[PDB]
Amino acid sequence: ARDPKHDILFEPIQIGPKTLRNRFYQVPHCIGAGSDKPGFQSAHRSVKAEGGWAALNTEYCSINPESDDTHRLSARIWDEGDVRNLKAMTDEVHKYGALAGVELWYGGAHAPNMESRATPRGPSQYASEFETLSYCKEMDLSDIAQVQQFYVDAAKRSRDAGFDIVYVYGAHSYLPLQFLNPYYNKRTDKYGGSLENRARFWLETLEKVKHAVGSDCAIATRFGVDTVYGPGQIEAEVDGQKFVEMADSLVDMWDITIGDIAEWGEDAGPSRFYQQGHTIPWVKLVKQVSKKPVLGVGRYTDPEKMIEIVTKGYADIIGCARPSIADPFLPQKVEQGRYDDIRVCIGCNVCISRWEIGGPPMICTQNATAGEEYRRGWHPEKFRQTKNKDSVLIVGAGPSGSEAARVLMESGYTVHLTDTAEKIGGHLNQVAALPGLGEWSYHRDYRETQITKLLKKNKESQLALGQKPMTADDVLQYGADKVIIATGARWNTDGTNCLTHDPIPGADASLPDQLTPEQVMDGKKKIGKRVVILNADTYFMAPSLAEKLATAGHEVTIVSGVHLANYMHFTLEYPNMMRRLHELHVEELGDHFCSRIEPGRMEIYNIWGDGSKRTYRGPGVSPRDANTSHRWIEFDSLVLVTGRHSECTLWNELKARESEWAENDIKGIYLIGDAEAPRLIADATFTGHRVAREIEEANPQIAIPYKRETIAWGTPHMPGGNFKIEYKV
Amino acid sequence: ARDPKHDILFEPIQIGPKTLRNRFYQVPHCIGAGSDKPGFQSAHRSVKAEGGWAALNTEYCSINPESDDTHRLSARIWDEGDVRNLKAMTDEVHKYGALAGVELWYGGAHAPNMESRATPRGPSQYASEFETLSYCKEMDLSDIAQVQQFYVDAAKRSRDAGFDIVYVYGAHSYLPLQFLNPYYNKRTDKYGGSLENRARFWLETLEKVKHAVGSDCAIATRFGVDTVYGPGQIEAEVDGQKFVEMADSLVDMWDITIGDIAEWGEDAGPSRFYQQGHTIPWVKLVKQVSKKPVLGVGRYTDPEKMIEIVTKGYADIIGCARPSIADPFLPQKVEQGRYDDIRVCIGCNVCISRWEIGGPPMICTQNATAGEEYRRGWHPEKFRQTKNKDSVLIVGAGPSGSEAARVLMESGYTVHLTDTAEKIGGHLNQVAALPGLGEWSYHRDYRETQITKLLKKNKESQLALGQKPMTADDVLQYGADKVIIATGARWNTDGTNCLTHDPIPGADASLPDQLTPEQVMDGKKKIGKRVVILNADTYFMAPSLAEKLATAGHEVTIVSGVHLANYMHFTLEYPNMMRRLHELHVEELGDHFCSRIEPGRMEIYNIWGDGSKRTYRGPGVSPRDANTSHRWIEFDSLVLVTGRHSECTLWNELKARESEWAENDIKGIYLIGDAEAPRLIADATFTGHRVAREIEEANPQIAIPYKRETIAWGTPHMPGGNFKIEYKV
Ligand SMILES: *c1c(C)c(C)cc2c1nc1c(=O)[nH]c(=O)nc-1n2C[C@H](O)[C@H](O)[C@H](O)COP(=O)(O)O
Ligand SMILES: *c1c(C)c(C)cc2c1nc1c(=O)[nH]c(=O)nc-1n2C[C@H](O)[C@H](O)[C@H](O)COP(=O)(O)O
Ligand SMILES: Nc1ncnc2c1ncn2[C@@H]1O[C@H](COP(=O)(O)OP(=O)(O)O)[C@@H](O)[C@H]1O
Ligand SMILES: Nc1ncnc2c1ncn2[C@@H]1O[C@H](COP(=O)(O)OP(=O)(O)O)[C@@H](O)[C@H]1O
Ligand code: SF4
Ligand code: SF4
């Protein structure tokens, strides 16, 4: 049953001329879709429609080629081709009976424009503190009118397109905010200086937009009421409130955030430094001056926390991004009181990783159909159920094999899931024990919860933890019709890395002063005063261990032969990770690899130590001047973080005797998770999702094709244009 | 007319079943188009077809979703949608009586596969030394059969798609090379170890591909004969020749490069460390051993150097890429001995900078239409002539106005080009005067050369150099019909950067210990022993200056508040620019910005000094713990590299008086190049390309729409496929 305290959550609300069925709102967020992947765009929001979110929005949407985000992908609404492709989504959000917003964006010099080549305009000439090579032109007054018309234009085309909501997107430090904020705005004419100068641009723009589609579409704005930068940018209690005050008659809805563009990690809080509701203290302050509907994200996945912020008159509605990617159905689950079925977004930000890399599609570590709803046509809550009696053994119940079973059992199969560990989760279990990552548990937590639930519903199906590792004999004699090995990967023992692809001589972590991140993480093996983490890994492992050990008070140097924490730049984690390693006085030696380990001693080298000029030096002979900077650093205990390898020992074995599966009634064995290859957690979890959804194809071991959304020669993006080559002569 | 030494160059050559008209052929290279931009692909290759090149290739072309390079773009030949889409270009190469090649690609784990999410295979389990989180699974021997299949399936569809040439791509360290090359191959079986095993993989592959389309299609290999690593990886005189030996019977033509993946710069040599023919030593060794046609890139632009390398039997053919982007017509310009009309690629590698960021189109610093041949139908050698007697004043003869001149005059306009510099070229004049960048002059060299010849043909046109800078009133009373201001930008003088967008306290390069990048390059200002360069810019200025000063024997520390030479990463400049800064004992202080300059001394700070824990702290205070890292360093002379700004003074003047333009018979004034806003040279040059082409539209100052290559809803990529959502249930 729905706990009736949550009723509050299903009460409509008025937003201008528009009505939100309920409180659950998907704010604008990218997905790797834009106007360019109209399949993928429609499907992924429409399931959240069907899932019962109230309003769904496109990601930030460009009003004009002089705000082009390439290499990133944004959405666009430049022409009637765009109004085509975005309408696919509106119709589709419509048929389920919520609303379609579209987020009107121009971002000035934050748009590098690498496709459109055009020149970006701003309040003042600057160069982006994010695309640092990309400068704007200073708008004169005629530039102020032409760009504003831009939005108008774009607001019209938004209505043709079928949007029920339009925004003047003023967050993450894009145009309207750049005017407002003195950081950017060095104008001394009437658009600058006085608080009502600064906000004229936006104030104007808002009005123009209202005038434009005001009577058919609610105009909302998003606004970044505090920059969390302090004095010198927007402060909520300085410019923030006041601005709210000056706008309020224009807005149908506020949509609130804090942060800029360069470290929007602060909006999209890592669970590694932010909890739920993080934003609230600055969220709150907006109701205390607005007389209008106010929502404001903050990784709100808990309906308890949801009701708090409404019954305490801190928001009116619930703004979500990530959590809607995790679980497009999270509302109808809350409406249906199905509390345990809710897939909790972990704050891992892989989802922001893809978009932030420039091009690839979003993927997600809980929701493996995210990105997969058009092109693979996987629905997150409906599954093809089997038309046989077939059964599956799954070895190992980590991300990979646990999704494996989740999906299969949801598919109706008969499954036996076994692992040698005592609990569901494979290596997530240590991972979540690293400082900060405690909310990454959630990913086995949800699995443990559903397999348990799935077992009462399949009667043959079986969970078995605490088992004796399986052998290939147990396996061939097991009686599953099919077998999924999902046995994992371990840190490399031997200094094997991405640079050399061979072992570091004198690396081996059976020796007393030499650790893996398993041994550091198990907590048994003893750890010397002086530590050196030898790092070949660009993702979280290294920094994190660093944090751990430092906080346990060792003296810490990371030797890095790769750019440390590079991945993290992309999950929005990097700022606060660095500041953090600073704070704990963690020493970083970059651009530095290692050539032999000895007790208490390792030989390290700068990777740009070779010679700058390349000569044909004949065979047997380096064609640079050789690298002469190697030097010997000591350590109590060395922690290798060099690479990882697949544990495919059993699968080696099962493969070797693949000749006996046929007598054993085994129709196939498939490899998945880290055991095929070391992958993201997300990607681990997909490979399970896949073999499952695909257990019935010829070779499940390999994916079947998926829709591709790429252009067909002889078809005009533009309606009724010439596809043909056409030179201007 | 054609110096007859050069006829050699137009002598046809046999390649298996296929005939090359002449010895000018464009090897495989990326443009940012692949399968996804078939207008673009077709056109950009067709005009090189029209221009006389004999065989044109697609860029690296994917055989299968488990080699996807997203977020990079490569081509695809995965199904019918692809065959259609690649067809357009083969049809279009064909109409000019040239060949169409397609380079068949598998990458193994250098394919991050972020679109497809699939798992890539190799000879051995590794993690790419490039895409460091992306690992492959190790082929069993069925794996070995499956992958080769792929090549075959792909090579048939190659044929359906209308290609004349099919490669087995083995360069830059992709799959084939990954077997052959022990750095990757750790197999102990019949695929591994001996030389005969290591080539097995390629060897079979080539076979089956020949068996597959051998009859209709030239089978090419591209092969990396030395990795330019030394022993341990491939050496020419070790396995290189020996490999060529083994293969020689299958291969209709060698295509030789040197280098790996993670630093392929060495193949695509920067003119800042490679001169023309740089590859030869290792290129020539191939002939020694081969009985087949051999070509081998080395940025050949010079027909002399061209005919050196054939007569010396070092090559049989001429392979370019870059020069082919530079001048699609280069050969019909050799052929027509119109040597002064050939646009020499300067080896700035900006072209490879877009592909390498991953997603954007290529663009080029000498050729403004590259990329621009489909979606804006600009042809590199054909201009829409003017239908009036209008005249243009252009103020400033730099990349941007000089390109503006060159195109306008080519379009029949009467132009008068004024610049207070002595020589055509604006800032590139200094910039070519940096260590290594001597080959960048070519980019003015070529326009001085065409404006001088255009004058002769357009008799009232005029060039005037060494003039008094124009004033607002000169311009008004100048009588041009329209005016182009192309006045430039300058390094910023007061410590204005992209991190505060404010000037630093105590920077001013009127003081005798503080210099700008112009002052430095001029060689006038005296510079003291110890130097700090305070860098905000992520391109070549800083490092270059460092290079020069150091080699002037000052003592050198780079302070950088951004990541130094980030761009150069993407030009493939970075490694050798590092080892160079290394060899010259140049000091690097990164993640360090500055808050105060005094005479002899500056106050710098760690950008990760602030605290990690963000609390709401009320207005007017920092919400992190404040930064306590500030500390003073000394210098004799300080070099500001902190940003740049637009010289827009004249323009702010002419527009204040826009009122009096009509009185003065001025229909408009348009602003371009750095003066509108600070941009690469490429871009600055494009801006001038653009206002020319478009001198006759509404508002020149703003570009017209170009065709876009995005999918239109309801049209399937797949022939006869379903565009509509369809979930699997
Ligand atoms: C892209 C990505 C995937 C993420 C997850 C967020 C995001 C993305 N693109 C956005 C954009 O187009 N415009 C915009 O205004 N916001 C965009 N977002 C951020 C999102 O809307 C939220 O503000 C944050 O994720 C924080 O809230 P929450 O997800 O914790 O609920
Ligand atoms: C892309 C870019 C634009 C550059 C010019 C080189 C290049 C690019 N993409 C390639 C890819 O598709 N596969 C491949 O094997 N090589 C690729 N290259 C290299 C190009 O083929 C040449 O090997 C070098 O550029 C040097 O040639 P040159 O331009 O000096 O004549
Ligand atoms: N012999 C096997 N039998 C049962 N479990 C195994 C066996 N080999 C490895 N495991 C288990 O496999 C799981 C592998 O998990 P993990 O690293 O998280 O891989 P993945 O991330 O892809 O799921 C672990 O819990 C480990 O206990
Ligand atoms: N006021 C002026 N009158 C004449 N020439 C000018 C004037 N102001 C600047 N210039 C010229 O403008 C050119 C600007 O060119 P440059 O900085 O190279 O711009 P870009 O990179 O856009 O080509 C410089 O060569 C300088 O000659
Ligand atoms: S990738 Fe992680 S943070 Fe993002 S929506 Fe998914 S579970 Fe949430
Ligand atoms: S960008 Fe530079 S290296 Fe490239 S084709 Fe153009 S001139 Fe050549």
UniProtKB/Swiss-Prot annotation, chains A, B:
The active site is at Y174 (proton donor). Binds 1 FMN covalently per subunit. Binds 1 [4Fe-4S] cluster per subunit. It comes from Methylophilus methylotrophus. GO terms for biological process: catabolic process. Its EC number is 1.5.8.2. The lineage of its organism: Bacteria, Pseudomonadati, Pseudomonadota, Betaproteobacteria, Nitrosomonadales. SUPFAM superfamilies: FAD/NAD(P)-binding domain (SSF51905), FMN-linked oxidoreductases (SSF51395), Nucleotide-binding domain (SSF51971). It comes from the Bacteria. Pfam families: NAD_binding_8, Oxidored_FMN, OYE-like_second_a-b. ADP binds at S400, D419, T420, H427, M470, D674. Keywords: 4Fe-4S, Flavoprotein, FMN, Iron, Iron-sulfur, Metal-binding, Oxidoreductase. Substrate binds at Y169, G170, A171, H172. [4Fe-4S] cluster binds at C345, C348, C351, C364. FMN binds at P28, C30, Y60, E103, R222, D267, R299, A321, R322. Its cofactor is FMN; [4Fe-4S] cluster. Homodimer. Forms a ternary complex with the heterodimeric electron transfer flavoprotein. In the N-terminal section; belongs to the NADH:flavin oxidoreductase/NADH oxidase family. InterPro entries: Aldolase_TIM, FAD/NAD-bd_sf, NADH:flavin_oxidoreductase, OxRdtase_FMN_N, TMADH/DMDH/HD_second_a-b, TMADH/DMDH_FMN-bd. It catalyses: trimethylamine + oxidized [electron-transfer flavoprotein] + H2O + H(+) = dimethylamine + reduced [electron-transfer flavoprotein] + formaldehyde. The modification S-6-FMN cysteine is found at C30. One of its GO terms (molecular function) is trimethylamine dehydrogenase activity. The keyword Protein biosynthesis does not apply. This is Trimethylamine dehydrogenase.
